[PDB]
């Protein structure tokens, strides 16, 4: 499905990055999660690519990259590929990405996420330098999903009255370069800690907030950076280096990343529910806020509960600019005047049927309406 | 290359202790003041082992406060990293599909340590 989306670099040019898309349709299946990836990438000519991975809730950081425009410089390097609800990140080597699809679950395919970063960038080799005059804390900055989250004890206390305090920072890696800057005038001890000084970070427009807090603390104090634009382009075995100045001092911390899965990838459920004492119980799908009274499409996916098997009688018909009301399903699905589509189930039964529907219409938010239904 | 160059309360980075190698160095900003210069270090090797940096030590000082400075281009310049806001010492990149390649934004506007380069 077409959900388009504006993005800008920000503070440096890294040249990797991270595009969250969490637009594009996903069910929470809770058992077979299958889904087909095909991505395009624009550069300059556009060397289309043809990414493909196909990984359920198992395998978060897969990177299948079968490429067709031809030797790109990278693409989708997967450290937090499927980490966060929906997150599915594209890396690059260190650009109005178009990507194409998620999941097939019926036939739709469509994505978009543009970035207005350099078509083609630049490589960043950065040479290994280890800031002599930084003592290295070695403090283990793990890159849990996508975003760094560190508390690294801050630079030091000097002249801590009156002070213009900057966290400008940076970290480096395998041929990254991307430094973090301290944004909104200069930070001079505002209450007792929790300053909540917003970071730049470089990388991306960052969706999620990205900003460390000084917390002050009499006269021993702390910092914690949580830059999210963190890649797998970092090595193995990276530093990143924290540079607090006051009235400068540098600290070196080993950063490495993490590739597991994350709590959920599925977007996020309406919760709904129903109550019924018939067995032939119907829901009425509520109207989504993000689209008009008229909208070109729109598609209620009946999908079971636990579905332990592959797709069975479940029916994604019922969309709009002639499309097919027959529901191939075992159910059977209705609407009323507005479009508010009211979903018959196939005889529901004692069981709660838990059916799960995922009215996407067009240019609107993916409303999963996950309703379980009660007998009573 | 003997000794790095240093600048106003920044950074000299990693060097060891060599005899007149010294190959990788970076300059970073001051902290409250930010840097105005390109940053890389690097000791280019001359007839003899002895040489000197490849590029002067940038100067690490206010730019206007938190002002901002007109837009620096040239026809045969590309704006990489670059963006209508700016603020402080903040820069840009320079290209072009047929000069240097970086112009900050200082508190004298218009260009940093450096002119805006132009190009073939
Ligand atoms: C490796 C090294 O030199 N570490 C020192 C640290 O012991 C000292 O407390 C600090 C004082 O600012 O300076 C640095
Ligand atoms: C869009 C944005 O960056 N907003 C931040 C705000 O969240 C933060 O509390 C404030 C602190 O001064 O700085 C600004
Ligand atoms: C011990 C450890 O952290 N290994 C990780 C590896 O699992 C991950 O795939 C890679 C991504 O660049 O970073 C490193
Ligand atoms: C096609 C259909 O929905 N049939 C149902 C029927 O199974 C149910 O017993 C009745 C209860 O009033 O409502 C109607
Ligand atoms: C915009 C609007 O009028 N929406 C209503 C909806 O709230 C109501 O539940 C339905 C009943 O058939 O009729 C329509
Ligand atoms: C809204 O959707 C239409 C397609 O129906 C698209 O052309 C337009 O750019 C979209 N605008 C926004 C803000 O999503």
Redesign the interface.
């Given at each position: 499905y077409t959900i388009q989306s504006l993005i800008?670099?920000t503070g440096?040019?890294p040249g990797f990055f991270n595009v969250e898309i969490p637009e594009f349709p996903f069910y929470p299946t809770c058992n077979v999660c299958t889904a087909d990836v095909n991505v395009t990438i624009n550069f300059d000519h556009q060397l289309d690519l043809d990414f493909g991975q196909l990984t359920p809730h198992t395998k978060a950081v897969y990177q299948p990259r079968g490429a067709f425009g031809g030797s790109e410089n990278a693409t989708n390097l997967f450290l937090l590929e499927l980490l966060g609800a929906g997150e599915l990140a594209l890396t690059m080597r260190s650009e109005s990405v178009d990507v194409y699809f998620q999941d097939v679950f019926g036939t739709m395919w469509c994505h978009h996420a543009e970035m207005q970063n350099?078509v083609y960038l630049?490589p960043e080799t950065v040479?290994?330098?280890?800031?002599?005059?930084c003592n290295s804390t070695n403090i283990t900055a793990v890159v849990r999903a996508q975003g760094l989250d560190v508390t690294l004890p801050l630079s030091l206390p000097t002249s801590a009255q009156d002070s213009?305090?900057?966290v400008?920072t940076?970290m480096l890696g395998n041929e990254i370069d991307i430094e973090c800057i301290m944004?909104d005038?200069?930070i001079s001890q505002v209450l007792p800690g929790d300053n909540k000084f917003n970071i730049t970070c470089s990388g991306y427009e960052s969706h999620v907030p990205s900003g460390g807090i000084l917390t002050s603390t009499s006269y021993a104090y702390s910092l914690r950076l949580t830059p999210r634009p963190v890649s797998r382009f970092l090595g193995n075995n990276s530093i990143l280096y924290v540079?607090?100045?006051?009235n400068?001092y540098?600290i070196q911390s080993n950063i490495v990343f993490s590739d597991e899965i994350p709590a959920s990838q599925d977007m996020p459920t309406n919760t709904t529910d129903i109550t019924y004492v018939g067995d032939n119980a119907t829901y009425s799908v509520p109207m989504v806020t993000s689209e008009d009274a008229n909208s070109p499409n729109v598609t209620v996916t009946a999908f079971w509960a636990w579905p332990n098997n592959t797709e069975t009688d479940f029916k994604c018909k019922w969309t709009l600019t002639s499309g097919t009301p027959s529901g191939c399903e075992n159910i059977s699905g209705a609407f009323a005047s507005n479009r508010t589509f009211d979903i018959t189930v196939s005889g529901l039964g004692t069981a709660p049927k838990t059916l799960i529907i995922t009215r996407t219409a067009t240019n609107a938010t993916t409303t999963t309406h996950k309703v379980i239904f009660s007998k009573a | 290359c003997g000794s790095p160059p240093p600048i106003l309360?920044?950074?000299?980075?990693?060097?060891?202790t060599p005899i007149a190698v010294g190959?990788?160095?970076?300059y970073?900003?001051?902290?409250?003041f930010?840097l105005i210069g390109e940053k890389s270090l690097?000791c280019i090797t001359k007839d003899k082992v002895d040489g000197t940096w490849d590029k002067p030590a940038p100067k690490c000082e206010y730019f206007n406060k938190?002002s901002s400075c007109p837009e620096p281009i040239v026809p045969g310049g590309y704006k990489?990293?670059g963006?209508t806001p700016y603020?402080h010492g903040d820069s840009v990149?320079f290209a072009c599909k047929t000069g240097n390649k970086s112009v900050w934004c200082q508190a004298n506007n218009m260009w940093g340590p450096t002119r805006l380069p132009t190009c073939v």
């Open positions: 800008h670099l440096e040019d350099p630049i040479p290994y330098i280890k800031w002599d005059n213009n305090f900057s400008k940076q944004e005038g200069e540079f607090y100045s006051g400068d540098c | 309360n920044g950074r000299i980075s990693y060097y060891s190959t990788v160095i970076r970073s900003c001051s902290g409250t930010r690097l938190y990489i990293r963006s603020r990149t």
